[PDB]
Ligand binder design. Structure first.
Ligand SMILES: CNC(=O)c1ccc(-c2ccc(=O)n(CCc3ccc4ncc(-c5cnn(C)c5)cc4c3)n2)cc1C(F)(F)F
Length: 281
C-alpha cells in the first residue's frame, strides 16, 4: 500500500509469536500482548505486541502508520524504540518493559523506591524529552502512566508514534468535534483554551509528571473537577508541594507551570537543574 519505506522494519510472521492469552495493556486501538521475537541474529527476546485491530479503515491506518513510522529514526536510552511492525491487524512490536508503566510501579506498595530513585526517574524523563524536543517532536500526552520502566530501572518515554493510544480512559476527555483526546489535568493552561500543543506545553506536563513521582502516583487536583480546572489555574493556583519533595525540586515544577509558555524552561534547562538536584543533598 502506497510507499513502502516501512519495509525497513517489517517483521516476518514466522519470526514473531503473539501470546494472545497474556494481556499486559489495553489501548483504545487494541490490546498489548506478551510476545516472543527472533532477532536478525537468531536470538529469542521478550517483547510487547500492540495491536491496532480496533481501527479498521485503509486510509486511517495508513495515516497512523506514516505519522508514527518516524519513531524508527529515534534512538535514545530514555525513549521507547520500535523493534518493528508485523503486517499479517497491523501489529506494532515493542521492547518488553519488566516493570510496566512508571505510575503503576511507584503506586505499588510492595515496591520501595527512595526519594533519590524518584528524582532520578524524573531526570530520565527529562533526558528523553530533551531528545524529542531536539528533533522538534511534540509529545502531546506526557504523563507518568505513559512512561515505562525496564529491567535496568531505565525509564522510557512512551505513548508516541505507533505506540500512541489511550491506555487509561479515566483521565481523558474526547472533544466532540475534533477527535482529540485531551488529558485535562496534565495539559498546559493555553492548551485547555486553544487545544494546540507545543514543546512548552510538554514542559508543563513534565512538571505534573514530576509532581506525580514525588507523590508516588497520586492523582493531580483530586478536589478540582474537570470544568473548574481552567479557572483554578487562571487564579494562579497550582499543585501543592508534596510532603517529601525537596524545595529546589518543587521550584522546578513551579517553573514548568508559568502562565506564559516562553517563561517555562527548555527541557535542556530542566535536565541541568534536575541533575544538579540529583547529585547534591
Ligand atoms: C496495568 N498497566 C496498564 O494499564 C498500562 C499498560 C501499558 C501502558 C502503556 C503506556 C505506554 C505505552 O506505550 N504502552 C504500550 C507499549 C508497551 C510496551 C512495552 C510494555 N512492556 C511491558 C508492559 C507491561 C505491562 N505490565 N507489565 C507487568 C508489563 C507494558 C508495555 C506496553 N503502554 C499504560 C498502562 C496504564 F498507564 F494504563 F497503566
Amino acid at each position: 500500500e502506497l510507499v513502502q519505506a516501512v519495509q525497513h522494519v517489517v517483521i516476518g510472521p514466522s519470526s514473531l509469536i503473539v501470546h494472545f492469552n497474556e494481556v499486559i495493556g489495553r489501548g483504545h486501538f487494541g490490546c498489548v500482548y506478551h510476545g516472543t521475537l527472533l532477532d536478525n541474529d537468531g536470538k529469542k527476546i521478550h517483547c510487547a505486541v500492540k495491536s491496532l485491530n480496533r481501527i479498521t479503515d485503509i486510509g486511517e491506518v495508513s495515516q497512523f502508520l506514516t505519522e508514527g513510522i518516524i519513531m524508527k529514526d529515534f534512538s535514545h536510552p530514555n525513549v521507547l524504540s520500535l523493534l518493528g511492525i508485523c503486517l499479517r491487524s497491523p501489529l506494532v512490536v515493542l521492547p518488553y518493559m519488566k516493570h510496566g508503566d512508571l505510575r503503576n510501579f511507584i503506586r505499588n506498595e510492595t515496591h520501595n523506591p527512595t526519594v533519590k530513585d524518584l528524582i532520578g526517574f524524573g531526570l530520565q524523563v527529562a533526558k528523553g524529552m530533551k531528545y524529542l524536543a531536539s528533533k522538534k517532536f511534540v509529545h502531546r500526552d506526557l504523563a507518568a502512566r505513559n512512561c515505562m520502566l525496564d529491567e535496568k530501572f531505565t525509564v522510557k518515554v512512551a505513548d508516541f508514534g505507533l505506540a500512541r493510544d489511550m491506555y487509561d480512559k479515566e483521565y481523558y476527555s474526547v472533544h466532540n468535534k475534533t477527535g482529540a483526546k485531551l488529558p485535562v489535568k496534565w495539559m498546559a493552561l493555553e492548551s485547555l483554551q486553544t487545544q494546540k500543543f507545543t514543546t512548552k506545553s510538554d514542559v508543563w506536563s513534565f512538571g505534573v509528571l514530576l509532581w506525580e513521582l514525588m507523590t508516588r502516583g497520586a492523582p493531580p487536583y483530586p478536589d478540582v473537577n474537570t470544568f473548574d480546572i481552567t479557572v483554578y489555574l487562571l487564579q494562579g493556583r497550582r499543585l501543592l508541594q508534596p510532603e517529601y519533595c525537596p524545595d529546589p525540586l518543587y521550584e522546578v515544577m513551579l517553573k514548568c507551570w508559568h502562565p506564559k509558555a516562553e517563561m517555562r524552561p527548555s527541557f535542556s534547562e530542566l535536565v541541568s537543574r534536575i541533575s544538579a538536584i540529583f547529585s547534591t543533598f
